[PDB]
From a paper:
Staphylococcal enterotoxin B (SEB) is one of seven toxins secreted by Staphylococcus aureus, and is classified as a bacterial superantigen. SEB is one of the group II superantigens, a group that includes SEC and SpeA. Superantigens in this group bind to T-cell receptors (TCRs) in a peptide-independent manner to generate an abrupt and strong immune response. This 28 kDa toxin consists of two domains, domain I (amino acids 30–120) and domain II (amino acids 127–239), which are composed of a β-barrel structure and antiparallel β-sheets, respectively.
We designed a vaccine candidate, S19, with reduced TCB–SEB interaction by introducing the following four mutations: N23A, Y90A, R110A and F177A. S19 was originally designed to make fewer molecular interactions with TCB than wild-type SEB, as a result of the removal of key interacting side chains. S19 maintained a similar overall structure to SEB, which is required for its antigenicity as a vaccine candidate. However, S19 exhibits some structural changes in its flexible-loop region. Although the entire structure of the loop region has not been determined, owing to its outwards orientation and high flexibility, the N-terminal region of this loop is well stabilized by intramolecular hydrogen bonds and by a disulfide bridge between Cys93 and Cys113. The Y90A mutation was the sole reason for the observed structural change, as depicted in Fig. 1(c). Tyr91 of S19 moved into the original position of Tyr90, which had been stabilized by hydrogen bonds to Asn60 and Asn88. The disulfide bridge in SEB was broken in S19 owing to the ∼8 Å translocation of Cys93 in S19. The interface areas between TCB and SEB and between MHC and SEB were decreased 27 or 14% by the mutations, respectively; thus, the simulation reflected the loss of binding residues. The number of simulated hydrogen bonds also decreased from 10/10 to 8/5, respectively. S19 was originally designed to have a lower binding affinity for TCB, but structural determination revealed reduced interactions with both binding partners, TCB and MHC.
Author numbering: 2 to 94, 108 to 236
The structure:
Amino acid sequence: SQPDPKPDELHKSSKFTGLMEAMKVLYDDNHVSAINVKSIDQFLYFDLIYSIKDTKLGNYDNVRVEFKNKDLADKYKDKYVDVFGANYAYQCYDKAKTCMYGGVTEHNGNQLDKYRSITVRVFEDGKNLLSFDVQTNKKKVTAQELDYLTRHYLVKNKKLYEANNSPYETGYIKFIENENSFWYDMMPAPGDKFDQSKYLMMYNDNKMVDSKDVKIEVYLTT
């Protein structure tokens, strides 16, 4: 449904002179993952606040999901959900609280027996040289979760974002569900700055897909 990237539409990493590590921390080993949690508070009319704890490093004790509109926050307000996504900030109104976008799926009637695998084909400058699987136990899973899994594998194995500079010039991730498909630009906007919240704001739609039918294709050009 979404048209594929037009010529020169993708972001060039060479036109980005900031620190690539900023984007790297978004898809490193650390993210927000919670199972069977209900909202506890609400700051603004398009967010929800969850008592999600950082068992890893103890950084955050509360997490604030931001949505694109109000119907999403009012939707998942009183429902027990699972949370999965990339956190970016540490704010106050004790431990601090971190923020993210979307990544909320309903719990009941959404868990699978075994781990469902999704195959990811990677194309470097045109040729399919790499292909790996990403697992999930969710019938309906956010595109943010699959994107974070894919980009995480690419972080650790192919050095997609390193601390300084990037080996890859352009790159976008493509989710194809049956007939329809959409894509996301993986490279930061040009300039010396990089706003984590503005980049991650693309996830505020809470776009979900079916793990049985979705297919993932990553396209990178050096």
